[PDB]
């Protein structure tokens, strides 16, 4: 159960980062990170897939209700690979990922605010920031985490967000999933060299997941070892 | 600048279509729009033209377009937000597949599971050209009137 919660994020992920690490500002604010970079990045055979990530909170006008909300330019595999359940609708095709449709995913709570009526979501349009957006899918949270006190959150194909309501080449991050059952330790340094190449400087700054995965795996199985062993010893004593 | 003036006998709209779609949008194509504040009160008219000079909001260039809506009763304040529907073509007598259940092998080939009269779902490869914001105009490989398991489809799966 707990591993399924953990492996729910698969194998693996190398989110791309600027600056130095998590706490950095200006060097992290600047991003020499073309989404085009992914091309050659996706070119490596061991990789199964790798995906762009970006997000922007913006004001959202609508009919009468008129409030800002966070939003998330992402892959269509997002709710898929996260396995996030849908309140309604689906994610989106890669074709329409290229289609730049004004399709979009929203919080159920966001609907709770927008829609006292509980009107059907699909086919409806609501502007984000400025651009009109024909809402379709909305997804229920797959975690409780009530202490998070989650606010309004929204999801877009990244091509649309970063594209036709941002236009920057530099997305917040890029997920990178390896194939082959390949080890987390290896190649991440090779990708590091890769960023030492396609960029001229030490700018990978990425975090990684079979490291923490394998170690918590050894941890849990170790707990199995202690528990089952002392149990069986006691029973043999019986 | 002592004082500004404006003629409100008719209202012009600045419909900022994205640069990706500007290549289409032939003049005189019929279009309609509606304001956020009145929810449902459609206005409509001919498109007039396209402005030669773009202006941008950081990322992504946008090109304007204009109408010429009549303004009875003194409604529509200046710079009011207005959602705008511009019309592309209406080819007819042809099926379009909802995108919710599409299968797309190769990214060219396109399998699609559909329920049969037997209660057996079965997929078929199909070719499709035209694509829509919501669906895709299928051209071959599926009959009209066919049941189509839009939700949680799998091939060969009798229900």
């Amino acid at each position: 159960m707990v591993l399924a919660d953990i492996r729910s994020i698969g194998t693996n992920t190398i989110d791309v980062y600027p600056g130095k690490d998590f706490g950095d500002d200006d060097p992290q604010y600047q991003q020499a990170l073309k989404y085009d970079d992914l091309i050659a990045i996706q070119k490596q055979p061991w990789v199964a897939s790798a995906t762009p990530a970006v997000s922007q909170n913006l004001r959202l006008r609508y009919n009468n209700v008129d409030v800002a909300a966070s939003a998330n330019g992402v892959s269509g595999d997002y709710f898929n690979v996260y396995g996030m359940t849908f309140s309604e609708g689906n994610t989106f095709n890669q074709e329409q990922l290229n289609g730049r449709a004004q399709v979009v995913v929203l919080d159920s709570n966001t609907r709770r605010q927008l829609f006292p009526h509980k009107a059907d979501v699909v086919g409806e349009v609501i502007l984000v920031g400025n651009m009109p957006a024909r809402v379709i899918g909305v997804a229920e949270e797959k975690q409780s985490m009530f202490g998070s006190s989650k606010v309004l959150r929204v999801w877009l194909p990244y091509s649309t967000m970063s594209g036709r309501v941002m236009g920057q080449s530099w997305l917040n991050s890029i997920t990178v999933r390896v194939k082959e059952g390949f080890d987390s330790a290896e190649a991440e340094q090779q990708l590091t060299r890769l960023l030492s190449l396609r960029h001229g400087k030490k700018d990978f700054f990425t975090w990684n997941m079979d490291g923490v995965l394998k170690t918590v795996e050894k941890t849990t199985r170790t707990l199995q070892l202690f528990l089952t062993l002392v149990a069986v010893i006691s029973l043999v004593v019986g | 600048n002592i004082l500004t003036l404006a003629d409100m006998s008719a209202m012009l709209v600045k419909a900022q279509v994205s640069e990706a779609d500007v290549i289409h949008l032939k003049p005189g194509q019929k279009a309609w729009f509606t304001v956020l504040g009145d929810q449902l009160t459609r206005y409509e008219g001919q498109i007039k033209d396209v402005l030669p000079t773009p202006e941008k909001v950081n990322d992504a260039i946008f090109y304007y377009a204009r109408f010429e809506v009549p303004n009875p009763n003194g409604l529509l304040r200046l710079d009011m937000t207005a959602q705008v529907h511009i019309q592309l073509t209406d080819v007819k007598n042809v099926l379009t597949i909802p995108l919710s259940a599409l299968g797309d092998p190769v990214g060219d080939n396109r399998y699609k599971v559909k329920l049969l009269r037997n209660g057996e779902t079965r997929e078929r490869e199909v070719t499709i050209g035209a694509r829509n914001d919501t669906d895709v105009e299928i051209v071959k490989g599926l009959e009209a009137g066919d049941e189509v398991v839009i939700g949680e489809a799998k091939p060969g799966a009798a229900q």
């Binding site: 009109p132 | 959602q83 080819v91 009137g145 939700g151 489809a153």
Partner: peptide
């Protein structure tokens, strides 16, 4: 486990491609 499937009746439809814009 119910094999229940959401489904639709396809018909010779007419194209409604036009898009939108703020």
């Amino acid at each position: 486990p119910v094999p229940t499937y959401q489904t639709l009746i396809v018909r010779p439809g007419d194209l409604q491609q036009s898009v939108l814009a703020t």
